């Protein structure tokens, strides 16, 4: 899913 | 776009509980990840937090990661302080894939009462002036935490260039002693009236200021 | 476990070039993006940029973009800082750390290097100019400015009531330091202060006597 360096919870 | 801000200096006895604070500006700080690193005095930096609240192996469980989504900010709290503690703290995050640091704060693991510090500016030589040079000194002494924002003035415009502080170092007391100098030309010397050195220690600001 | 190991110290002349490296080792080069922090003498960590040792993208800082080079080598799991043309401006502790998952799993903790010192001096021996700090209570503090030589060691000594002696500053790769002494209001100016400023790399001593304006 998420595809961008540190950009998660 | 994003920023972390930072308080400079934090402090507490041995025993004591103390919490470093790094607030997240232009971007909410649940979007992203944050990661605290611990510098000592001489050695090279580690992680001591990763992921919000995570600790690598053999940091202890007293070191502990929070985030808080109403004032936008994460905490390192660090309870039972001892000496090892005494460091340069940094957070970390993440916008658009770049790394974003604090400033750092220094934990001071206090040893000895807290010390303002004695502040004398002094003006430029007319030795010195005759070189086309003009070199104020702002002098600091005897202040613990060893931790000092200076700011220049002149004539009420805040100097952003031509400024530079020494790190603290220690006296014989292990007290901190510091110097700022502001270098100019001559020709800026005679433009402007009225010079301030102003030194912020513990949140409270004393200003040495002169005439030409 | 997990090891960044570093080049040693570069101690170079301005204008010169230098590429620090950076061997990992104990996971996959790949999964972790490493990360470029520099510095300068008693200043913060500054973040330079990063390389996605993944899809080969490199990102620079604003203020780094230029005369900073990132690369890597896949094949030896190894990192490049190239520096171009240095400046003494560039003087610093220059850290190897790694980054965060270039794909879908955590464990992404910040290990970092011993870091690599990049000195970047003319090394030329320089006496230093010597100027007199006199003021514009019961005490008076007059002082010494020490400003723009080479190399560290110079010593300050005072005759007239305790002295304070600053650390030296480093700026264009000349030292500049400052020396206070505190006596009694009384004993100046109606008493000679002068101060003694060795310089043993030059061979130089100057005494200055501090007049009053
Ligand atoms: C080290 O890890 C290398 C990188 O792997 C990827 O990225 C990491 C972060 C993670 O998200 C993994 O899921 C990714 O695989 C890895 O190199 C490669 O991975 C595969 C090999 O299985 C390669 O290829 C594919 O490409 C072919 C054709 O090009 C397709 O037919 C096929 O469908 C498949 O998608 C990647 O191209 C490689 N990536 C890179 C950057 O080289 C490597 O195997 C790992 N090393 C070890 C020793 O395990
Ligand atoms: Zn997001
Ligand atoms: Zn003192
Ligand atoms: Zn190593
Ligand atoms: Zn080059």
């Given at each position: ?9 | ?51 919000d609240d995570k600790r690598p192996s053999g940091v202890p469980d007293r070191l502990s990661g929070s985030t808080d989504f109403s004032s936008n900010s994460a905490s390192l ?136 | ?72 080598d896949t094949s030896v799991s190894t990192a490049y800082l190239h520096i171009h043309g240095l400046k003494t401006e560039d003087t610093a502790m220059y850290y190897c750390v ?52 080479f190399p560290e060691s110079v010593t300050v000594t005072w005759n007239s009531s305790s002295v304070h002696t600053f650390p030296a500053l480093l700026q264009s790769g000349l ?39």
């Amino acid at each position: 899913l998420p595809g961008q360096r540190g950009e998660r919870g | 776009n994003l920023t972390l801000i930072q308080s400079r200096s934090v402090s507490g006895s041995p025993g004591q509980t103390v919490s470093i604070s790094c607030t997240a500006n232009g971007a909410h700080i649940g979007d992203s990840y944050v990661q605290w690193f611990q510098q000592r005095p001489g050695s090279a930096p580690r992680s001591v937090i990763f992921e919000d609240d995570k600790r690598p192996s053999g940091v202890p469980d007293r070191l502990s990661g929070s985030t808080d989504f109403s004032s936008n900010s994460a905490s390192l709290t660090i309870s039972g302080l001892e000496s090892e503690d005494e460091a340069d703290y940094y957070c970390q995050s993440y916008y658009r894939g770049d790394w974003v640091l604090g400033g750092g704060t220094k934990l001071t693991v206090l040893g000895q009462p807290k010390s303002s510090p004695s502040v004398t500016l002094f003006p430029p030589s007319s030795e010195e002036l005759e070189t086309n040079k003009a070199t104020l000194v702002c002098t600091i002494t005897d202040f613990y935490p060893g931790v000092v924002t200076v700011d220049w003035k002149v004539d009420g415009t805040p100097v952003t260039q031509g400024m530079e502080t020494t790190q603290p170092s220690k006296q014989s007391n292990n007290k901190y002693m510091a110097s700022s100098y502001l270098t100019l030309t001559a020709r800026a010397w005679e433009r402007h009236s009225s010079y301030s050195c102003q030194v912020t220690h513990e949140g409270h600001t004393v200003e040495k200021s002169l005439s030409r | 476990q997990v090891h960044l190991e570093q080049s040693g110290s570069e101690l170079k002349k301005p204008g010169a070039s230098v590429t620090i490296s950076c061997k990992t080792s104990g996971y996959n080069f790949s999964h972790f993006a490493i990360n470029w922090v520099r510095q300068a003498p008693g200043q913060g960590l500054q973040w330079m940029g990063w390389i996605n040792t993944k899809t080969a993208n490199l990102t620079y800082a604003q203020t780094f973009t230029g005369r900073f080079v990132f690369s890597f080598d896949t094949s030896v799991s190894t990192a490049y800082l190239h520096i171009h043309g240095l400046k003494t401006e560039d003087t610093a502790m220059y850290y190897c750390v790694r980054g965060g998952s270039l794909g879908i799993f955590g464990g992404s903790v910040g290990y970092w290097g011993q870091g690599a010192l990049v000195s970047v001096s003319s090394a030329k021996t320089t006496p230093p100019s010597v100027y007199p700090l006199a003021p514009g209570g019961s005490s008076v503090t007059l002082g010494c400015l020490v400003k723009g030589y080479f190399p560290e060691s110079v010593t300050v000594t005072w005759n007239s009531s305790s002295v304070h002696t600053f650390p030296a500053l480093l700026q264009s790769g000349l030292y500049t330091m400052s020396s206070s002494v505190t006596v009694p209001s009384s004993t100046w100016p109606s008493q000679t202060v002068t101060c003694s400023v060795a310089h043993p790399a030059s061979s130089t001593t100057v005494d200055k006597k501090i007049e009053p304006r």
